[PDB]
Structures are given as C-alpha cells and as structure tokens.
Amino acid sequence: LPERVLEILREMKRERIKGASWLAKKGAEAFLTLAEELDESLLEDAIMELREEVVKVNPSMASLYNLARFIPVTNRRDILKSRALEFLRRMEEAKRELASIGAQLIDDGDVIITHSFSSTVLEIIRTAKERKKRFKVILTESSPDYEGLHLARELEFSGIEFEVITDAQMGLFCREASIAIVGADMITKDGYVVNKAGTYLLALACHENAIPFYVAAETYKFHPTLKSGDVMLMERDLIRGNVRIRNVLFDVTPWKYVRGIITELGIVIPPRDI
Amino acid sequence: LPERVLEILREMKRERIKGASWLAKKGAEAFLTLAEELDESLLEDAIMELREEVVKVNPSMASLYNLARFIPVTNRRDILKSRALEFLRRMEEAKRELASIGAQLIDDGDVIITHSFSSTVLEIIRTAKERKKRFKVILTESSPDYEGLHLARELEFSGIEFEVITDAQMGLFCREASIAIVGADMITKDGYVVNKAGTYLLALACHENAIPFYVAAETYKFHPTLKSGDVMLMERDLIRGNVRIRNVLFDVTPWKYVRGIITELGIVIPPRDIQ
Numbered sequence: 001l002p003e004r005v006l007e008i009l010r011e012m013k014r015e016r017i018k019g020a021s022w023l024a025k026k027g028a029e030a031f032l033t034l035a036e037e038l039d040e041s042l043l044e045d046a047i048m049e050l051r052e053e054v055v056k057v058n059p060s061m062a063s064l065y066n067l068a069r070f071i072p073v074t075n076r077r078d079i080l081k082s083r084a085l086e087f088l089r090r091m092e093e094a095k096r097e098l099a100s101i102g103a104q105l106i107d108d109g110d111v112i113i114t115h116s117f118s119s120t121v122l123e124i125i126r127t128a129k130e131r132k133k134r135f136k137v138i139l140t141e142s143s144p145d146y147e148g149l150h151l152a153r154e155l156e157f158s159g160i161e162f163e164v165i166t167d168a169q170m171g172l173f174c175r176e177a178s179i180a181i182v183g184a185d186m187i188t189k190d191g192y193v194v195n196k197a198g199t200y201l202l203a204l205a206c207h208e209n210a211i212p213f214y215v216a217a218e219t220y221k222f223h224p225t226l227k228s229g230d231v232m233l234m235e236r237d238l239i240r241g242n243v244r245i246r247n248v249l250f251d252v253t254p255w256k257y258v259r260g261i262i263t264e265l266g267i268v269i270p271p272r273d274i
Numbered sequence: 275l276p277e278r279v280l281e282i283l284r285e286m287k288r289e290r291i292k293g294a295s296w297l298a299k300k301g302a303e304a305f306l307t308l309a310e311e312l313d314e315s316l317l318e319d320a321i322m323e324l325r326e327e328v329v330k331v332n333p334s335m336a337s338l339y340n341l342a343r344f345i346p347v348t349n350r351r352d353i354l355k356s357r358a359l360e361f362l363r364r365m366e367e368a369k370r371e372l373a374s375i376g377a378q379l380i381d382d383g384d385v386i387i388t389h390s391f392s393s394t395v396l397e398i399i400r401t402a403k404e405r406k407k408r409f410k411v412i413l414t415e416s417s418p419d420y421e422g423l424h425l426a427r428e429l430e431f432s433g434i435e436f437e438v439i440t441d442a443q444m445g446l447f448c449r450e451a452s453i454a455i456v457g458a459d460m461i462t463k464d465g466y467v468v469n470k471a472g473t474y475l476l477a478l479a480c481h482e483n484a485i486p487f488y489v490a491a492e493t494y495k496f497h498p499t500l501k502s503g504d505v506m507l508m509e510r511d512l513i514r515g516n517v518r519i520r521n522v523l524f525d526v527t528p529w530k531y532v533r534g535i536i537t538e539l540g541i542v543i544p545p546r547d548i549q
Contacts, residue, residue: 141519143417143440149515164519166417167442168472172507172525198442204478233446242425245415246439251446 001049002037005030012057016145016173020185021119024063027054028084028197030070033229044073047080059232060194060250063091064188064225087220094121094218094264102181102216102262103127110135111177114212115170116196118183120216124262137162138173142196143247144238144247154233167198171200171205180206184217184261191255191271193217197248199237203257203268212259228252275323276311279304290419290510294459294495295393298337298365301328305345305490316350321354325331333506334468334524336460336497337365346398366493369394376455377382377401378475381534383411383418384452387480389444390470391421394455394490396428398453398536403434411436412447417468418512418521441472446482450485458491458535465529465545467491471522477531489527490536496548502526 008030008112012023031050038046058064070087074080097202102124105114112135114121125137137155141164142148142271148164155162165173172178180202193199193215206213231252238247255270268274275283286300304324312320325342333337346363350356376398380386386394386409398410411429415438416422422438429436439447448454454476460468467473467489479486505526512521529544542548 131389140442141417141514142515146514148319149517152517153515164517164520166471166512166519167440167472168414168417168475169520169522169525171474171523172471173479196442197440199447200445201442201475201479204445204482205475208478217350240415242421242424243426243438246437246443246447248439248443248446267341 001053002022002044003270004033004037005050008033009053011059012119017147017150019118019147019183021091021095023058023068024086024220027057027064027067028088030054031084034080035077035084040075040077042172043075043077043080046146047071048247052053056235060185060234064219066220067225080132091220092120092186093219094220095123097264098262099123099127099262101266103131103133104165105214105221105262105267106133106135108133108135108181111138112136112204113138113170113174113177113180114141114205115148115182115199115202116142120218121183122151122154122180124181124216125160129158129160138165138177140165140167140170144240144245145168147159154240157261161193170198174202174206174211175209177206177211180211180213180214184215184221185250186231187222187230187261188221188226188231189219189274190227191274192252193255193258194231194233198252200253203253206212207257214259214262216262219265241246253271275320275327276308277492278307279309279324282307283327283331291424293391293393293420293457294335294337294420295369296363297332297335298341298494301331301338302339302358302362304328306355309351309354311356314351317351317524318347318352321345324343332508334459334508336495339497340494353370359435359518365484365492367495367496368538369397372536373397374489375404375538375540376536377407379488379541380407380409380453382408383449385412385443387447387451387454387476388412388415388425389414389422389441389456389473389476391425392490396425397431397458398490399434400432404430412439414439414441414444414453414472416472417441418519424537426479444472444476445479448476448483448485452486454480454490456483458489459524460497460500460505461491461496461535461544461548462500462502462505463497463548465548467526467529468505468524469529469534471525474525474527477527486520486533487531488530488533488536492509493537493539
C-alpha cells in the first residue's frame, strides 16, 4: 500500500476520541487516496489489501466492514473514488435524517443519560435544541481516553445544560434520567448492540429502574451476517501509573434491554425488525 | 477540641486510598488523643462533640457511627482510653476471623473479581493464598482516585496473580469470574450494602451472568437504625480537563443481588439474618 494510504490508516488507529462516524470517513479517504496514488494495473490487488486493513483498524465497527464491502474490486480509479464518495454522502444523509427522528423522540423536560461519544447522538441532541425543546444531559467521562469530556465541550459550545459523571456512577444516575440514548459501533444480525465498554452496565441499571433505553444507529452500522457470539471486541494497549491495565474498548448489550434502535428509516424494534 | 484531635480529623478527611477500616483506627486514635489532652471535668462534653465530628468525616461508613456509640460519655480518663483500645482490639480480631471464613469460601481455580479497595477483602485473598488455594483476581482501577491500583500493589507484594480493568469493563469481566467479593462501608438496617460507587453495577452484571456475589463486612460495619432510603452518599469535588465532574463516592446495592455477607461470626444471609 502507498505511503499516503498507510498514513491515513495510522491516523485511524491513533484516534481515541472521534467515533465510528469519523473513522468511516477516514476509511473512505483511504480508498480515495489509493485510487489517486496507484497505477490502475495494481489497483485490484491493492483494493483487496486495503479492504482487509480498514476492517482491522477496528473489527468492532460495522461501518468499516460495510465500507469495505461497498468498495468494488476494480481497475478503474474513477469508479473506486466514486464509490468511496458515494458511501460518504450516504453516511451524511443517514445521519441528518436519523438526528431528525431522534430529536422528535425527545420530550420537553427530558433528562437524557448517555455514555461515551457519538457524533450521531450529539446531532440528535443539537437538533432537539434547535427545535426549542428543553432538556438536560447526563454523560460519563468515559475511561480511559475520556471521549466523554469531548462531548461535554461540544454541549457546552452549544449552550446545552449537562452534568458529567464517572462511568462507575451510571447506576446512581440512570434513576435521575427520563431516557437513555447511546450510539452504536455495530448492530449484530441477531439484534445485539456493540458499543463502548460499559454501555451494557448502563443498560442493566436503566432496566432495573424502568428508564427507556434507546440506541442510535444508521443502517450502515448494521452488520449483515455477524451474530453476537462471534463479535470481536477490540482491545488497545493501556498503561497508566506504570501498571498494565486490560482495555477491551467495546462490549455487547442484549436487545432485551433496548427499547428501540433509532435509524434513518425510523425507530426499529430488535430483534424482529432485525 | 484539642489541636491534636482536630488534626487527626483532617487527616481522616483527606484520605482517599485506605477505606473504612483505616478511618476507624484514626477515629479511635482521636479518642485516645482526647484522653491525653483534657481534664476529667471537660471530658464528657468533648466526647459528645467528637462523637459527632467522627461521624461527620464520612456518614457513609457505619464503622464511624458504631465507634462513636462504643465510646461512653464518661469523665473517666482510664475508661475512655480502655474502650478506644478495646474497639481497636475487636476490629483486628474481627478482620482476622472474617478473613479465615472468607478464605474458606474461595476454591481452587477461582477467578475472583472485586471493585475498589477493602483491607478486609485483601486479607481474605491473602489468607486463601497462604492456604495454598490457586486463583486469579480481576480488579478495577476505581475512578477517580484509583484506590484499586493500591490493591494491585498489595497483591503484587503477596505474589498473587491479578488483572486490572477500568470500571466500565466490569460487565465484560463478571463473565470470566467464578465469584465476586467486595467490601462494604455500611450494611443498612434493611440489608442493603453501601459501598464504592459502581458496586451496584458489578452486582447487576454478576447476577445476570450467574456469578455468586459476596460482601465482606465485619459486624461493626452494620448500622443498627439507618435504612437504605435514608443513607447519605458522600461526595468530593472533581475536575478533569476543564470540566467539572459530579463525584458521588458511594452507592447502594439491594440485598437481592447479594449471596451473603461474610462476617467474623459467619456468613449471614440478607435481609432476614440482618436484625
């Protein structure tokens, strides 16, 4: 693979805050750069190679798997770039339509509890505010990279009322919330939700306290064939205080704890609506 | 109150690694100190005031409340001193006996998961290892003060195999565990367990995955009158980045997620045996 393609892949593997959305976009740019740098004579093999590499960046993200599958093995640069750009446009459209459907679900007076950082969830919240709905957000700092603090700074910029808590405090706070909205890295074929580690715990707490738990996920985050049991939960080396700490970054939440999945096509009920 | 006493009160207040047990000792030290600074005639009121200040250190720890009721309101220096030293003797004896019973519970091949730091849970683990039981421990770093790393340092000192995880990973790992053992800052009158924030989540995940959840709590950690709904959960200020973070340090776990409470008198079953 060309140097510029490898740079983008390293930039992707290096990301700790931005979520699936940003990562998928970078994956697309990786294919664009490939078509712009290689000879149409080596393109087909290079594409298969890049397909494998993009998915390996984070096997817990269905968006990367769907992106790779969407890209054809072609010897034509223009077709390769066109498919990559088309996938991006589809992502953007899916996100804004989902945000609209999500903002509609939110009620005035709501106290929304969420976890980790999701570009889609942030847009749902910003759209709700734009529509003049009053509400408050409870979010977690999200260890170990604290992508949650990024969400906090975004909500602050938008003038939205929020409260930050530690991950361990989710049980104490689901109670004060009227609804839970989290994002997703993958929706399995059998309807389970793969998302940031700890999402499962929030789901359990919210169920015991009767707080509707919703998941926001564009259809490009749905894996067409992988079932919950075979999901690969990516792990990243973590050292703090000179001590090695296990760091499985993603978890799995059973559908029985999920009210519904907010998609660009409407709110779907797992697992029957698949 | 005397300066020496007021200084111990401060020392207890800014402690965040060592838990209940340690605070209980400092509380006793406060009363022992009071007995060396005041005259018999001012002793009774001073004890009344210290009783209150000691409990204020952390209303989430029943050990402080029980320590306060153990120390009599008397004008007898020798009595005050004697009672404080007896409380200390009882704590040590309680911890040792509870450890022996807890270790007995552990089995070869266990993968024990725990949360936060508890000197009692630590002694249970050490006693089990000393009796040649083979096992591994999964523990959380415990945000935001990371007292969990203190546990890791101690387990390393003892040659015990362990793995550290972040609090949010507790659900992914109850799965690997065969048993869970956590400490407690208080066992309410109705059988609920007050402990480091996050214990409740561990309890929920382990119940979902059929992993026996045990709580280690000496009898002096049982509060005689406070019910779960009236518990005060202490909070400290916290800031990371330029963001203020809510930091409620303790939570409440219903008894229905607890297999049993390991005491120095044996393993009790909440809430029925908690009377």
